[PDB]
């Protein structure tokens, strides 16, 4: 198809960023409602960090990125994981690989 260029490319990019940001926020909001309804354990970074390293061995230091990464993965990517313990397993797996 025709390549978008100049102003049109930039505007497509801007609107697509807005769409994806709205979907990003929505995926988490919906996951939270669902999590509360099924009694999934509340996400707690501090307590999670007390069974695994959430820094990438010191790579990720920004705590607001550390929180966003794991909180969101817990709710959005693993809706069927019910406990922090069980999710522990998963994060361990993730850092065993690249």
């Amino acid at each position: 198809m025709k390549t978008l260029t100049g102003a049109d490319a930039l505007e497509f990019h801007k609107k697509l960023k807005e769409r994806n940001k709205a979907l990003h926020a929505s995926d988490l909001e919906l996951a939270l409602v669902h999590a509360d309804a099924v009694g999934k354990e509340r996400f707690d970074l501090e307590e999670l960090e007390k069974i695994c390293d959430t820094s990438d061995a010191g790579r990720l230091t920004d705590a607001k990125e550390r929180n966003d990464i794991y909180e969101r993965m817990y709710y959005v990517e693993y809706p069927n994981v019910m406990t922090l313990k069980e999710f522990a397993h998963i994060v361990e797996t993730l850092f065993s690989w690249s």
Partner: protein, 329 residues
């Protein structure tokens, strides 16, 4: 036996994480001398390969550059480099692909431990291999070629996350390197298929399902942030995004080249900038799925290899299949 090599070959007790565990590993006195010497040997090999790459790149007139190959596991990154970065393809042929910064470069060597056969699993050697990749990348930072010019380097990690992207941009700025980034996308199922095709006797990692799925989510979600960095700073370098058409062919989807932003395929651009959260872990590999995937592969050889990889795990879910495939030594 499943303690990691860091435990087995580390002397004394292991501190538990940054910055405890980290610095313990950095001190050679904390390893058995045999392991210490193996570390020195692997770094020497990796550094010689990287210098060969860097010399080829400079002779071909390339200014100091960080070539970054972003993208999830088994998305077709090696083929993109061969076809779409001709100056790098020429360097890589001289090293048979070696010399790149990759947390998996040292894994096979560490898993064999010079004994002639693989005796540790990928997971047992991961921390040690990542420790080595960190020392390797550290020494490349200010590495010079024979003209005293800053050495060009290749980073082929997933590079999904914002903090990873930021750190390599900062590295490039601090060391006077351009960033030349190709970002390569494939559907998740393609990566899963690609992983099942990787044979245990080969060197490519065989991660289990959550690695590949979480990698896919992260690479997609954080893609536009990367593009934003190149749009915002024309002097950063250049960016190209390649996506995968229905037939498996890679096509350019978006680019920032010469500070100029273009969208070559807006339909794919909309698709491959989000994780499309509808799951696959439980989907069963059956005749129909295999027939479906074969239906979109025309190359006889790839079609055949794809079929064989999948047939081996016929009746299993994607998750169980990658699990079983990962556990092979």
């Amino acid at each position: 036996q499943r303690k990691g090599t860091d435990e087995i070959y580390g002397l004394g007790s292991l501190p538990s994480a940054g910055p405890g565990r980290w610095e313990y590993l950095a001190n050679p006195g904390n390893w058995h001398p045999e392991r210490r010497k193996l570390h020195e040997k692997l770094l020497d090999q990796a550094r010689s390969s990287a210098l060969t790459l860097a010399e080829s790149l400079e002779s071909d007139g390339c200014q100091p550059t960080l070539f970054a190959l972003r993208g999830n596991t088994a998305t077709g990154k090696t083929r993109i480099a061969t076809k779409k970065i001709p100056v790098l393809a020429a360097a890589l042929k001289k090293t048979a692909g070696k010399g790149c910064v990759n947390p998996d470069v040292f894994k096979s060597s560490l898993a064999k431990s010079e004994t002639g056969a693989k005796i540790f699993s990928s997971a047992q050697v991961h921390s040690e291999s990542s420790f080595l990749a960190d020392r390797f990348e550290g020494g490349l930072r200010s590495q010079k070629t024979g003209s005293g010019a800053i050495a060009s380097i290749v980073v082929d990690k997933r590079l999904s996350r914002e903090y990873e992207i930021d750190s390599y941009i900062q590295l490039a700025k601090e060391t006077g390197r351009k960033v030349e980034l190709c970002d390569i996308d494939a559907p998740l199922e393609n990566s899963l298929v690609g992983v099942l095709q990787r044979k245990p006797e080969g060197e490519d990692p065989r991660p289990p399902y959550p690695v590949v799925s979480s990698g896919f989510v992260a690479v997609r979600s954080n893609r536009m942030y990367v593009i934003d960095r190149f749009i915002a700073d024309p002097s950063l370098g250049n960016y190209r995004l390649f996506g995968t058409a229905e037939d498996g062919e890679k096509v350019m989807v978006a680019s920032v080249i010469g500070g100029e932003f273009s969208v070559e395929n807006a339909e794919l651009y909309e698709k491959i900038t989000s994780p499309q959260l509808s799951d696959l872990a439980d989907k069963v590999i059956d005749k129909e799925l295999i027939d479906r995937l074969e239906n979109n592969i025309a190359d006889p050889e790839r079609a055949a290899k794809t079929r064989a990889a999948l047939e081996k795990y016929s009746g299993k879910s994607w998750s169980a299949a990658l699990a079983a495939h990962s556990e092979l030594i």
